[PDB]
Design a protein around this motif. Sequence first.
Motif, PDB file in Angstrom:
ATOM      1  N   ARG A 162     -14.214  -1.815  -9.114  1.00  0.00           N
ATOM      2  CA  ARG A 162     -15.556  -2.202  -8.694  1.00  0.00           C
ATOM      3  C   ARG A 162     -16.212  -1.230  -7.696  1.00  0.00           C
ATOM      4  O   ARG A 162     -17.399  -1.332  -7.454  1.00  0.00           O
ATOM      5  CB  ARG A 162     -15.603  -3.636  -8.180  1.00  0.00           C
ATOM      6  N   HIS A 183     -10.432  -4.240  -7.324  1.00  0.00           N
ATOM      7  CA  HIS A 183     -10.901  -3.553  -6.109  1.00  0.00           C
ATOM      8  C   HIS A 183     -11.185  -2.066  -6.362  1.00  0.00           C
ATOM      9  O   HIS A 183     -12.251  -1.562  -6.018  1.00  0.00           O
ATOM     10  CB  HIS A 183      -9.891  -3.758  -4.963  1.00  0.00           C
ATOM     11  N   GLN A 203     -10.573  -3.898   5.762  1.00  0.00           N
ATOM     12  CA  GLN A 203     -10.416  -5.052   6.637  1.00  0.00           C
ATOM     13  C   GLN A 203     -11.444  -4.956   7.759  1.00  0.00           C
ATOM     14  O   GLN A 203     -11.696  -3.869   8.299  1.00  0.00           O
ATOM     15  CB  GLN A 203      -8.989  -5.108   7.210  1.00  0.00           C
ATOM     16  N   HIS A 242      -7.879   4.439   4.873  1.00  0.00           N
ATOM     17  CA  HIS A 242      -6.857   5.424   4.523  1.00  0.00           C
ATOM     18  C   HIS A 242      -6.509   5.214   3.046  1.00  0.00           C
ATOM     19  O   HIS A 242      -7.011   5.929   2.181  1.00  0.00           O
ATOM     20  CB  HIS A 242      -5.621   5.290   5.426  1.00  0.00           C
ATOM     21  N   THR A 243      -5.679   4.224   2.750  1.00  0.00           N
ATOM     22  CA  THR A 243      -5.514   3.819   1.339  1.00  0.00           C
ATOM     23  C   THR A 243      -6.888   3.488   0.731  1.00  0.00           C
ATOM     24  O   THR A 243      -7.203   3.859  -0.393  1.00  0.00           O
ATOM     25  CB  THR A 243      -4.573   2.607   1.181  1.00  0.00           C
ATOM     26  N   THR A 244      -7.715   2.793   1.497  1.00  0.00           N
ATOM     27  CA  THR A 244      -9.020   2.363   1.002  1.00  0.00           C
ATOM     28  C   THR A 244      -9.929   3.560   0.720  1.00  0.00           C
ATOM     29  O   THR A 244     -10.791   3.511  -0.161  1.00  0.00           O
ATOM     30  CB  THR A 244      -9.665   1.441   2.037  1.00  0.00           C
ATOM     31  N   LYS A 288     -11.731  -3.107  11.456  1.00  0.00           N
ATOM     32  CA  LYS A 288     -12.053  -1.697  11.659  1.00  0.00           C
ATOM     33  C   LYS A 288     -13.492  -1.457  12.121  1.00  0.00           C
ATOM     34  O   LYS A 288     -13.839  -0.340  12.518  1.00  0.00           O
ATOM     35  CB  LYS A 288     -11.757  -0.886  10.391  1.00  0.00           C
ATOM     36  N   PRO A 307       0.798  -1.238   0.000  1.00  0.00           N
ATOM     37  CA  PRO A 307       0.000   0.000   0.000  1.00  0.00           C
ATOM     38  C   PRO A 307       0.831   1.289   0.000  1.00  0.00           C
ATOM     39  O   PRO A 307       0.477   2.250  -0.677  1.00  0.00           O
ATOM     40  CB  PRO A 307      -0.803  -0.112   1.300  1.00  0.00           C
ATOM     41  N   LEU A 328     -16.435  -6.938   2.461  1.00  0.00           N
ATOM     42  CA  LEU A 328     -15.524  -7.958   1.945  1.00  0.00           C
ATOM     43  C   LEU A 328     -15.247  -9.055   2.969  1.00  0.00           C
ATOM     44  O   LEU A 328     -15.268  -8.817   4.168  1.00  0.00           O
ATOM     45  CB  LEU A 328     -14.203  -7.324   1.509  1.00  0.00           C
ATOM     46  N   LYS A 388      -5.776  -5.642  -6.785  1.00  0.00           N
ATOM     47  CA  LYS A 388      -5.802  -4.189  -6.605  1.00  0.00           C
ATOM     48  C   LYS A 388      -6.650  -3.415  -7.640  1.00  0.00           C
ATOM     49  O   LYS A 388      -7.521  -2.620  -7.283  1.00  0.00           O
ATOM     50  CB  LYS A 388      -4.368  -3.665  -6.611  1.00  0.00           C
ATOM     51  N   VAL A 446     -11.952 -10.561  -1.373  1.00  0.00           N
ATOM     52  CA  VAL A 446     -10.914  -9.568  -1.653  1.00  0.00           C
ATOM     53  C   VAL A 446     -10.454  -9.798  -3.098  1.00  0.00           C
ATOM     54  O   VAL A 446     -10.411 -10.942  -3.554  1.00  0.00           O
ATOM     55  CB  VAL A 446      -9.736  -9.703  -0.665  1.00  0.00           C
ATOM     56  N   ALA A 447     -10.153  -8.717  -3.817  1.00  0.00           N
ATOM     57  CA  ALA A 447      -9.867  -8.782  -5.244  1.00  0.00           C
ATOM     58  C   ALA A 447      -8.478  -8.246  -5.508  1.00  0.00           C
ATOM     59  O   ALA A 447      -7.906  -7.569  -4.643  1.00  0.00           O
ATOM     60  CB  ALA A 447     -10.911  -7.930  -6.023  1.00  0.00           C
ATOM     61  N   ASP A 484      -8.871   4.870  -2.610  1.00  0.00           N
ATOM     62  CA  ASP A 484      -9.407   3.917  -3.582  1.00  0.00           C
ATOM     63  C   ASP A 484     -10.876   4.225  -3.939  1.00  0.00           C
ATOM     64  O   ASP A 484     -11.271   4.254  -5.116  1.00  0.00           O
ATOM     65  CB  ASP A 484      -9.289   2.481  -3.014  1.00  0.00           C
TER      66      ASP A 484
HETATM   67  O1  LIG Z   1     -10.452  -6.218  -2.430  1.00  0.00           O
HETATM   68  C1  LIG Z   1      -9.502  -5.538  -2.078  1.00  0.00           C
HETATM   69  C2  LIG Z   1      -9.576  -4.751  -0.932  1.00  0.00           C
HETATM   70  C3  LIG Z   1      -8.487  -3.952  -0.586  1.00  0.00           C
HETATM   71  N1  LIG Z   1      -7.350  -3.985  -1.362  1.00  0.00           N
HETATM   72  C4  LIG Z   1      -6.129  -3.234  -0.997  1.00  0.00           C
HETATM   73  O2  LIG Z   1      -5.645  -3.823   0.192  1.00  0.00           O
HETATM   74  C5  LIG Z   1      -4.956  -2.858   0.961  1.00  0.00           C
HETATM   75  C6  LIG Z   1      -5.515  -2.823   2.374  1.00  0.00           C
HETATM   76  O3  LIG Z   1      -4.501  -2.302   3.216  1.00  0.00           O
HETATM   77  P1  LIG Z   1      -4.838  -1.446   4.556  1.00  0.00           P
HETATM   78  O4  LIG Z   1      -5.706  -2.304   5.394  1.00  0.00           O
HETATM   79  O5  LIG Z   1      -3.576  -1.093   5.229  1.00  0.00           O
HETATM   80  O6  LIG Z   1      -5.550  -0.146   3.969  1.00  0.00           O
HETATM   81  P2  LIG Z   1      -5.803   1.240   4.747  1.00  0.00           P
HETATM   82  O7  LIG Z   1      -5.881   0.947   6.176  1.00  0.00           O
HETATM   83  O8  LIG Z   1      -4.670   2.167   4.458  1.00  0.00           O
HETATM   84  O9  LIG Z   1      -7.054   1.783   4.187  1.00  0.00           O
HETATM   85  C7  LIG Z   1      -5.098  -1.526   0.241  1.00  0.00           C
HETATM   86  O10 LIG Z   1      -3.915  -1.337  -0.504  1.00  0.00           O
HETATM   87  C8  LIG Z   1      -6.255  -1.750  -0.716  1.00  0.00           C
HETATM   88  O11 LIG Z   1      -6.139  -0.928  -1.871  1.00  0.00           O
HETATM   89  C9  LIG Z   1      -7.280  -4.788  -2.486  1.00  0.00           C
HETATM   90  O12 LIG Z   1      -6.260  -4.809  -3.184  1.00  0.00           O
HETATM   91  N2  LIG Z   1      -8.358  -5.554  -2.856  1.00  0.00           N
END
Ligand SMILES: O=c1ccn([C@@H]2O[C@H](COP(=O)(O)OP(=O)(O)O)[C@@H](O)[C@H]2O)c(=O)[nH]1
Lengths: 697, 12
Positions: A573, A570, A508, A589-591, A511, A247, A535, A567, A564-565, A594
């Motif tokens: 969709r 994900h 995830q 955060h990253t999500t 959270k 990420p 997911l 990148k 989960v798919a 996204d």
């Molecule tokens: O179906 C999915 C769901 C999530 N992600 C990726 O999985 C990572 C999840 O990491 P993290 O839990 O650290 O994300 P954050 O907390 O920063 O949102 C991120 O890079 C998402 O873009 C993915 O590739 N496929």
Amino acid sequence: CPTHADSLNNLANIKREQGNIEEAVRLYRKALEVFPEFAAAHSNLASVLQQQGKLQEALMHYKEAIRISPTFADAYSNMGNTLKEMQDVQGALQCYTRAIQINPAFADAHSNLASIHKDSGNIPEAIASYRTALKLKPDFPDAYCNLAHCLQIVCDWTDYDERMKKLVSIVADQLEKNRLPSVHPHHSMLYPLSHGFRKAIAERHGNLCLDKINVLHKPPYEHPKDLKLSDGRLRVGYVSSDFGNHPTSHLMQSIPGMHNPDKFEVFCYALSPDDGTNFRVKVMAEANHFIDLSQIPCNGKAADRIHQDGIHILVNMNGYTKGARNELFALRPAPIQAMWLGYPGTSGALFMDYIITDQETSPAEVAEQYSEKLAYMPHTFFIGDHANMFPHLKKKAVIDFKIYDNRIVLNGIDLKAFLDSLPDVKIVKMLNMPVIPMNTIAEAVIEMINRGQIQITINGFSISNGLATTQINNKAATGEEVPRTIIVTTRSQYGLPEDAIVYCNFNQLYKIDPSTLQMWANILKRVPNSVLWLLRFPAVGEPNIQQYAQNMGLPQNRIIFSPVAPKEEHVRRGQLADVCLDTPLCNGHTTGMDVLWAGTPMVTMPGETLASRVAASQLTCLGCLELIAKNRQEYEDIAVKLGTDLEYLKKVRGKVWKQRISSPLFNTKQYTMELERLYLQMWEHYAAGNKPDHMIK
Amino acid sequence: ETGTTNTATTAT
Ligand SMILES: O=c1ccn([C@@H]2O[C@H](COP(=O)(O)OP(=O)(O)O)[C@@H](O)[C@H]2O)c(=O)[nH]1
């Protein structure tokens, strides 16, 4: 004398508990002079040697203890902990299983084994081993707190109230008695701990690094006080275990290359070996200097290398995450050291000077929560590489299967060129939106999806089933390459209803807490024609969420789960949802980035921790303050309004779709310049002989 | 990476 050696060993155990590791080592060593064949002392010395990072020397002593005493279960279990830290999982497993074979009632060994199961992703087995440990030793903070984290991962909220009460009780007791908290700093945001406790937890973990660098006996480094040796350029070093398919690279991989080579010299310090991905290739190619510190495992030698490069600002992108080597920062080879992007919280450490954040994320009135000084970026400290990685999603078209913007979607680099080859495309005002009418071509696309075909060819263009990207181009699926084909994504691919509101959250599951699901339940109850899309992250959390939802009055078919798919899939969709409901406990955060890149509005409610306020900072930069709620009431009303007032939904979705491009949120070029200005304010402040102070303007 | 618990052995 046995009695003499025993007293030395026992006193050393006391020094160890008190945190006097150096004195403990001295006393275990004295014990071994008196009685060389003292198994307990070998095993205990090995434990503190491990704490000082002297792993091979520790292994030698564990093996000596076991030679002397073949059924010494403590030594096997302790040795396994050392093997685990050396990434020899098989060796650790062999030690723990041997220790339990010797003494089935050995609580520590059960808890240590559970940690392997937990790190391997086998949560039900980790839970079972932690429970066994607790049965055997009911007062066991490490096992209890790691068990609680396992339960969080799978959304098992059994006796959750008592669980939180006990976690806080444990941390309070440990902090008072001057012990290392069994709650990890990265997890502290998930539990109702005070801000004071959270900073102290981080501070004590940072002090573990000191135990490892003190044995090195290195003098302080001499730091540059001008830019003369670097021809007026500021030397920035980025330190990360995550240069590769992680990420962190998906967020900042463009930044080293976008630094101004006239004013900045960029050094990237990888803590990990080359994983062979384009993410790693790119950073190695675009950074001015790329240094593989995974080849320099000795922290003393690594810090020396950093210092010899003459780094002015050294940037910690790991914090307390896997792969970190914070010992490098504790050695302080650079005059200015800053936390950035990778870790959503304070280091709590004396050796970090700044945390790069923003006013929305870390308002001045909460500066007490941080050990660093606040260094504000002007918009959000958050950034993503979506504009570079997924430009095929900048544009879309839909098919009129009856008009919806999110039931049947096509995206592509070549999308406009394909639309030209068609003699009947309708343009709808909402940029605008091309609609393909229900004709022969549209039927062929829809048949591809319904038959689960991989791809078809129309007028020479390749049109792909969005579920089959890895079979077509694995690098396109991971985000290493931009897809070349026109891709089709539909609600039918994921079992989403064609005629209802879809609320999503792709985080995830850890959270989610009970309070969060209750809020989501309320929204769904008020928007009768709606589902929640989540997911299997992990899959074993699904029946738990379903139970608690059913218990709150929601039938099972109101919540739809997807695997989960890859990148790219994900991110793509996300276009199928109407609204994303952010998790208040710890935001996407990253999500979050996204979801916004997809054009999907995200409803958020910022809390008091850094991790709970990031989505609001992203939305503020984006220019959508109407999506930010001040309490749970408003979060529900905003979400309900988006789901029931379909004209308001169209407006807001259009606003996100347009502003992901026009706002600075995904603008890596602008971000880099702003980061460069902040670096300079940091430098001039130090060059004028000042200690770190808040740069909040 | 999940933390582990070292066991301290008392001499008797
Ligand atoms: O179906 C999915 C769901 C999530 N992600 C990726 O999985 C990572 C999840 O990491 P993290 O839990 O650290 O994300 P954050 O907390 O920063 O949102 C991120 O890079 C998402 O873009 C993915 O590739 N496929």
